[PDB]
Amino acid sequence: KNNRQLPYLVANVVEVVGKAAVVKTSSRQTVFLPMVGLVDPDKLKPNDLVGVNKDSYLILDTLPSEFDSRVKAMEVDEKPTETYSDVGGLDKQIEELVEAIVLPMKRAAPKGALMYGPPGTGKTLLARACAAQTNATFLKLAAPQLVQMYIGEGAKLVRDAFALAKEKAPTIIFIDELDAIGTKRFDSEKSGDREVQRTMLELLNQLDGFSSDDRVKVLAATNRVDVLDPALLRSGRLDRKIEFPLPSEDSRAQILQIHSRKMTTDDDINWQELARSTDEFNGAQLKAVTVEAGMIALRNGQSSVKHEDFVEGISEVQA
Amino acid sequence: KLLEHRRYDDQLKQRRQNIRDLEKLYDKTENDIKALQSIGQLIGEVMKELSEEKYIVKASSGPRYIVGVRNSVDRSKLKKGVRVTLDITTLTIMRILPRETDPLVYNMTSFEQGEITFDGIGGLTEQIRELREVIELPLKNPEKPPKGVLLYGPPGTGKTLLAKAVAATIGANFIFSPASGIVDKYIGESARIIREMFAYAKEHEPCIIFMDEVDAIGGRRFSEGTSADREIQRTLMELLTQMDGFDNLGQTKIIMATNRPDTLDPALLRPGRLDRKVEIPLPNEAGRLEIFKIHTAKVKKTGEFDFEAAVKMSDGFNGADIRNCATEAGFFAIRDDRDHINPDDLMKAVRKVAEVKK
Amino acid sequence: ELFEMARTKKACIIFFDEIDAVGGARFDDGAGGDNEVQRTMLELITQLDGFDPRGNIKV
Amino acid sequence: EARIKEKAGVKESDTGLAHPLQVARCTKIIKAKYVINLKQIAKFVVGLGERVSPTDIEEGMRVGV
């Protein structure tokens, strides 16, 4: 009979004499009840999701903490498949990537690493690469969401981000432009943004809450960081300060390769030339050249794309 | 011919044993079945006793109500602030209650003492002693008690761990406070939060109160305008109220946390609120080497593993940076196949540790 | 919501006059109040990067 | 006509006391209520297992998340 409703009100707990429990509803209403039938004193504990007859205030079900907000705008692409052949030249850190994530994952430590350098390289992809590679839950997470009107909403979000990810852990939580939340300023004026700060602090505390979980992997990219912390460099917090240098030319020839890859080409191509003529392109500028050369190559009528085409992509002002 | 006794007892033994296996679950489930008749009953504290029956009780869910007693009720025991079970329709006392609130381990964070003692993070020893005497002891020597103690420097260096190591040494319940949850939104909940943090601890004392890095709920704010900063100031003051106010640390003590001190309300730093401003410098070459052979060498390592020269190259590191030094070589260890770290693993790390920062 | 209804309106031109409104590259995070405004870009920065089709959704 | 027609539609909400939508109040069905409140009254999620309702979760005329 009493089963069930979608959803219930939930409530949290104080007492668990010994048969006694008092709970405060999602309606913000406290009832006593002799501990109901469908629940277990261990299931019972404060701060919990529970099925409760809304009318009777009779707890029906214990509820797992699941729809405890994923701030559903939080974007979880689960371990998408991306190679290290995706954007080349980065083997430096790819090692470190492995060294900061893969190896800490599979043996017996860092809970996360810290990117810096401009993305569009596929820094994102690097994450996405390891998202495939390490097979830990990838969280593509924009701090703007962590940036909120509610007070400590972000922290809540961060806690949100923390916990449900800890379920999907092994997880790699990606963060873009940490400096968003990466400035505490200097001062006692910090409530100015308490959000971006405390969220960091909350995060720091989360990064502080554990050490050994490789289940939690924390990946933060910036163009460059602003404030430093031995939280920002720590075993169990952000351990690894990871450079993303704008690649070298053969590395660009390596990356342009991947971009030139799916292109139809007659091989007038010489990459290194392009690679030499180009300077420090994060991958997509090669791809931009790749892009333009194609539009060019069509304007040339060419199905295949040629070196000159790419030269003309370059020619399309790269500055 | 005699195989029947089994086929008799075989059935029998199990059968007769299978009796209450099944049968137990019924009544238990039946209780659960039954208890579904047992219905929830509202809660509240007595604001006061109007008449012996007549009560002023603010619903724990909501506003005040004029109510009477019910039954099995002691109009004696019924008293101000007393949690009582209340009625949904009759709207009167459905029972008289003990009381406590809040997620003790969550909104409040309740962990007893600390994981490793002061020694394991030793090399902060100045503080280690210095704090203990100004924190632990004033309990056990009735001959001010201390107001407040504020860490600063880089966290977790042992820094955040200090609290646990602190918390460990006293015996009090360590109660951790992260900040913003104390006023998320949640357009209110200030003292009720903090006083539960006070009062629960005040009842549960000895308790350690540790408030994390308190610049969102601490600090002097900005223009001191209203972002909801007026929330913070309150919250900022709620402590001030408990501190510059008569509320003492009876057996419950308060550890303040910041990574930077100058980030706090000047009035907060004041005695009557804070009697200690706890620095955490970086370990010296000694302190490092101290912490070095502490944090590090306890990870399995060769004597080949380079003890001081690492420390020589180990400079401006913290307690966890020391651990990083270990942890980094550990990369090379798992990279060199080492349970015991080897000097090879090490100083690659050391510079690499001395690389990113000092 | 932009990027949301971007994909709703797909084959759509997201057009910004006044990229200078949010500002451009800046250190005014060193001041510390601008951060969100800066982030608002980084917002715009972040999300537009990875998943948004810009052959259809024009920026 | 449309009134009484949509009065059904009205009543089609009005059972269980019930494109942004913001909040669906599809209200108080306990067996069941099949709605989300994102709002400070009785926040709700239908899920945890396979949880739907054939055309429409429930009510408000509002039916949805």
Side-chain angles (χ1 to χ4, degrees), chain B residues 44-58 64 67 74-84 93 96-99 195 203 246:
Chain B
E45 280 185 347
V46 175
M47 189 171 299
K48 70 171 298 183
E49 171 165 5
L50 173 56
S51 80
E52 293 186 351
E53 57 183 346
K54 293 173 180 181
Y55 296 144
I56 298 171
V57 172
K58 183 180 178 181
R64 287 189 171 172
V67 306
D74 295 348
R75 309 170 70 178
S76 65
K77 294 177 177 175
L78 296 165
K79 287 168 180 174
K80 180 174 180 178
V82 173
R83 178 191 298 277
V84 296
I93 302 166
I96 305 167
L97 299 180
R99 182 182 178 283
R195 295 178 186 162
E203 293 175 348
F246 60 87

Side-chain angles (χ1 to χ4, degrees), chain A residues 219-243:
Chain A
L219 180 59
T222 61
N223 285 279
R224 180 184 176 169
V225 65
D226 57 356
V227 318
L228 290 177
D229 197 359
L232 303 178
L233 293 175
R234 184 185 181 87
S235 179
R237 290 174 181 159
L238 290 177
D239 182 63
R240 299 283 294 166
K241 185 181 177 180
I242 304 305
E243 61 178 339

